[PDB]
Write an enzyme that holds these catalytic residues in place. Structure first.
Site, PDB file in Angstrom:
ATOM      1  N   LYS A 185     157.429  38.360 -76.432  1.00 41.46           N
ATOM      2  CA  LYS A 185     156.191  37.594 -76.549  1.00 41.46           C
ATOM      3  C   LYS A 185     155.006  38.545 -76.472  1.00 41.46           C
ATOM      4  CE  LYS A 185     154.328  35.039 -73.164  1.00 41.46           C
ATOM      5  NZ  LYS A 185     153.325  36.019 -72.587  1.00 41.46           N
ATOM      6  N   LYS A 228     154.350  44.521 -75.629  1.00 36.76           N
ATOM      7  CA  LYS A 228     155.532  44.865 -76.386  1.00 36.76           C
ATOM      8  C   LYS A 228     155.296  45.980 -77.436  1.00 36.76           C
ATOM      9  CE  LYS A 228     156.616  42.230 -79.886  1.00 36.76           C
ATOM     10  NZ  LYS A 228     156.252  43.073 -81.049  1.00 36.76           N
ATOM     11  N   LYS A 267     150.047  39.625 -83.722  1.00 33.79           N
ATOM     12  CA  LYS A 267     149.308  39.829 -82.467  1.00 33.79           C
ATOM     13  C   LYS A 267     148.637  41.186 -82.217  1.00 33.79           C
ATOM     14  CE  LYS A 267     149.331  35.792 -80.511  1.00 33.79           C
ATOM     15  NZ  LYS A 267     148.071  35.042 -80.402  1.00 33.79           N
ATOM     16  N   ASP A 317     156.721  35.028 -79.875  1.00 34.17           N
ATOM     17  CA  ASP A 317     156.115  33.767 -79.470  1.00 34.17           C
ATOM     18  C   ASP A 317     156.718  32.518 -80.034  1.00 34.17           C
ATOM     19  OD1 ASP A 317     154.142  35.165 -77.844  1.00 34.17           O
ATOM     20  OD2 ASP A 317     152.816  35.274 -79.604  1.00 34.17           O
TER      21      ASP A 317
END
Ligand code: SF4
Lengths: 269, 269
Positions: B9, B14, B40, B126
């Site tokens: 997520k 990450k 992201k 996600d």
């Protein structure tokens, strides 16, 4: 009936805000339906009390073809009717597609009753893909409010959501009713959010304060209005509710460039 | 060539870990290519010294059909070949489509060369939908590492990601190689991450500690090995790399039950 949708990045208390907002609307005599479309958040749990009600996609696979409404819609705090879409088959499938399935199964089972003052779709805004824009593109959601905190990734998501809204604000009549700040800190980033929203051509309809009560009500599986109607925070939610209900500011938002984002960050953040 | 995907997520670093991990393999004479598939964060911004390369999708829009490999693949730290697939047009495109487009272009432009030791796909965790399972589904990635922290939402994502992994392991070569912990200051985080990874039938391959070393290097837009090689955090990444390169535990993961996970987060603090 107002067909509202709440979008926003995960991890900033968006579902909690959406739920608390409805109690505030209920406190105004409103009849409301809530449909969770957020595979990462329990969208009706603070309203039904810890009951992670079973999803539509889950009911189908067991109640099969003879599914009954009362299985998918449960009445919560103050009579708010609660439903949960359910996520995509892991690694296959589309969340967007399943939100469609549920919504159509709701209409089909006649859930959109003439006494409804509101319906809210609590939608995840982590991926602003065509799958999550389903309710806007299909005409289910006409009035959108975006939840954001004064942090870059939540602001970025908000901007992105507005990009998607913008593309449908034309063919359809979807519009942005406003941005809601979920203060994630002691630093009241009211000014950043207010500037960010006005830049889109929208407004900061309400600033939700950081309160230790949200956390209590939450532990207790309730909204601040069900858990303690007398606190300041309860009034905050009632105030958000009245401004949404009275709102006449509906716009085709004007997305910003990343660069513009940064400038607003510096000047007001 | 090892075809690895790093899922997890957002909000827990990450991508920083992905880039830092490749840096370590670079330290091992390893020749590597990184493919960002994560709307992201910038999956290559730290390899490219803080350079925000255009994406395949941007590029195609720009360079049209006559797409040059050197436009989309940029050599960064120690020879690491970087590429960013580009996210979906907001409200319209599926994140997966772009991933496939990009991977096809790379293949068509001969980027999948013989001298390749590793190819890494940095993927958003996600939503465990089909769009995000594209590197896996397209066969492209057979070896998976999931980045998680002690936070509950991170472990839920990780568990949800393992379901998607298992959907293809039993028919494709896809296997889980391990869980990597991006520490988020959690009481008893290590024992917890190790019981979680074990619960799935896997392992806590490496615990990446928080250090002010990472926040500095990223202000400058560098990986740590790159910054101070002599530094424990840079050494942390070299160990991470040698542990991944020498890995032999590759499993068809056993997703646990929500009750099985809450138990663990109860038993471990
Ligand atoms: S449209 Fe979105 S939710 Fe649907 S499969 Fe693609 S990335 Fe996933």
């Amino acid at each position: 009936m107002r067909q509202v949708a709440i979008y926003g990045k995960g991890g900033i208390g968006k579902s909690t805000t959406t739920q608390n907002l409805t109690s505030g609307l209920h406190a105004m005599g409103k009849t409301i339906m809530v449909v969770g479309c957020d595979p990462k958040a329990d969208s009706t749990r603070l309203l039904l009390g810890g009951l992670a009600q079973k999803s539509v996609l889950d009911t189908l696979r067991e109640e099969g073809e003879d599914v009954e409404l009362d299985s998918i819609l449960k009445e919560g705090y103050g009579g708010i009717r609660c439903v949960e879409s359910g996520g995509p088959e892991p690694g296959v499938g589309c969340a967007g597609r399943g939100i469609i399935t549920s919504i159509n199964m709701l209409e089909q089972l006649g859930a959109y009753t003439d006494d409804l003052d509101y319906v809210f779709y609590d939608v995840l805004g982590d991926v602003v893909c065509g799958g999550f824009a389903m309710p806007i593109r299909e005409g289910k959601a006409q009035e959108i409010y975006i939840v954001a905190s004064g942090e870059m990734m939540a602001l970025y998501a908000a901007n992105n959501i507005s990009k998607g809204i913008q593309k449908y604000a034309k063919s359809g009549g979807v519009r942005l009713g406003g941005i809601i700040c979920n203060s994630r800190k002691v630093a009241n980033e009211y000014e950043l959010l207010d500037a960010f929203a006005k830049e889109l051509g929208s407004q900061l309809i309400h600033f939700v304060p950081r309160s230790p009560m949200v956390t209590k009500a939450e532990i207790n599986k309730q909204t601040v209005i069900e858990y303690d109607p007398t606190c300041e925070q309860a009034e905050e939610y009632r105030e958000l509710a009245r401004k949404v209900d009275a709102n006449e500011l509906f716009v085709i938002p004007k997305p910003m460039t990343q660069e513009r984002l940064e400038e607003i960050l510096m000047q007001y953040g």
